């Protein structure tokens, strides 16, 4: 896994 799930809230 990568850190996309961690950083997803920053893109909303």
């Amino acid at each position: 896994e990568d850190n996309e799930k961690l950083r997803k809230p920053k893109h909303k």
Partner: antibody
Amino acid sequence: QVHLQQSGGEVARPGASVKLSCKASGYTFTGYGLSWVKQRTGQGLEWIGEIYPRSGNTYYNEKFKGKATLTADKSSSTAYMELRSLTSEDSAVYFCARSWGNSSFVYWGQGTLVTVSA
Amino acid sequence: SIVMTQTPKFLLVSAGDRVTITCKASQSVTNDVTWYQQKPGQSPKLLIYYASNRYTGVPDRFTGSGYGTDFTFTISTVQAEDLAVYFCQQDYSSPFTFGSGTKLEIKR
């Protein structure tokens, strides 16, 4: 031992495209999002977009949609940014920067200078 | 998007002086503000993250603080080698936005 090695400076013609590269070493390439950042010399820094090499998923700054396309090649641990329809405003230094945790730009490449000119 | 207003735009100080840089966000960004040092020729170097935490190997003379909209960056005693442009950046939400930078210059 994270290292991001960017391609050398280039001239490119107005209206043409140019593809910059960012070769990653010292970590698992698919582990982290990787962004590109534009700097005009002596001026500010602008986030262009981010790509996650595990999935290929991309997120763009709205201002660079239609200008920049981010890709990645797992086999060579290389990130690419292609700039299209080049204009004088695209001449700048471009950095790649790698994320860590939820933080965007922790490890930085050395930068690539693009000069748009015939 | 969120605008980071960085002041002052330049500093002219003597070695050993204290310097404080200020960054104000157009809306709350909690504590997710990063401070970078960019020396001539180089890429930006991360010094402070989450407003107040020193990155690994950053000297003790660099500090930051702030929560919400007002953030400061402090060099307690400026050294000759600290000549650089310093940038704040909000990492709270996309598009991630930087301040315009502060050029630190030395008088001797």
